[PDB]
Design a protein around this ligand. Structure first.
Ligand SMILES: CN(C)CCCn1cc(C2=C(c3c[nH]c4ccccc34)C(=O)NC2=O)c2ccccc21
Length: 273
């Protein structure tokens, strides 16, 4: 069962992702997050290799949850008559990156380099598993504050990765690329690199570069904080108006600004403890 296996604590939050509770696994006191979603509120459905009808979020989580990674892993799930319940890892102590940036302001470049590197590795993992997240942003990144490790959450907007065009999008608008705005058409990897350009700007400036559709498509990037010319160059490249002018993940990780990255533990020691 669920309630004999997990001890459910207070509500952590709710919204378009359902209702998430703090919990502990009873067997070993492992901190977990317990997420509930009504079946009537699920738009995207898929099926598991064995052919069960499940939320697409379950299909995508199962694909990325094998081995270690910078993704919050799905430990179990349950079907109820009117809902699904997903058991997810929970770092403790934890803070999402939106709250971290809101509290601390723009990040030092050393710290943004470490964090951005970890996000890239996490996204490469998803892509290697056949999964496109489609909502990479500060709110969907958890920081394990003791370990200096970042973890991707909320696969509720994701899709199976493909090489053909996507014509549906229900991630966050301000992280969405100009080709979606103009044409309602994007390709998965170049749209992911656009969202990563937004995220990188957000880390070093303390806010997103574009508020309106017209700024998204004009793609003029103005800096509000002192940012090195190398970091500006990488951000502007990720935010190229033409999807084919954006860097690959390889080109991003080979960029001069991305060199001499700190590992997660030293990141924590220098910047978080
Ligand atoms: C703006 N917020 C707080 C969005 C929360 C997004 N979100 C966090 C979580 C998770 C966690 C949360 C950790 N703190 C939270 C506060 C509110 C809601 C969720 C959490 C967690 O520890 N592990 C998670 O997977 C999550 C799980 C499925 C779908 C969306 C999820």
């Amino acid at each position: 069962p669920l309630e004999s296996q997990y001890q459910v604590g207070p509500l952590l939050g709710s919204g378009g992702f359902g209702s998430v509770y703090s919990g502990i696994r009873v067997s070993d006191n492992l901190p977990v997050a317990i997420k509930h979603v009504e079946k009537d509120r699920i738009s995207d459905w898929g099926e598991l290799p064995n052919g069960t009808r499940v939320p697409m979020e379950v299909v995508l989580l199962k694909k990325v949850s094998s081995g270690f990674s910078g993704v919050i892993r799905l430990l179990d799930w349950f079907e109820r008559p009117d809902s699904f319940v997903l058991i997810l890892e929970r770092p403790e102590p934890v803070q999402d990156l939106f709250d971290f940036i809101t509290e601390r302001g723009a990040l030092q470049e050393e710290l943004a380099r470490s964090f951005f590197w970890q996000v890239l590795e996490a996204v490469r993992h998803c892509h290697n598993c056949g999964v496109l997240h489609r909502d990479i942003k500060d709110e969907n990144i958890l920081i394990d504050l003791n370990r200096g490790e970042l973890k991707l959450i909320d696969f509720g907007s994701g899709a199976l990765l493909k090489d053909t065009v996507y014509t549906d999008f229900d991630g966050t608008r301000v992280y969405s690329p100009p080709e979606w705005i103009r044409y309602h058409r994007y390709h998965g990897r170049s749209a992911a690199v656009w969202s990563l350009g937004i995220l990188l700007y957000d880390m070093v400036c303390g806010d997103i570069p574009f508020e309106h559709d017209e700024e998204i498509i004009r793609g003029q990037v103005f800096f509000r904080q002192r940012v090195s010319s190398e970091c500006q160059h990488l951000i502007r490249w990720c935010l190229a108006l033409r999807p084919s002018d954006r860097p690959t993940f390889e080109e991003i990780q080979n960029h001069p600004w991305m060199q001499d990255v700190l590992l997660p533990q030293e990141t924590a020691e220098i910047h978080l403890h």
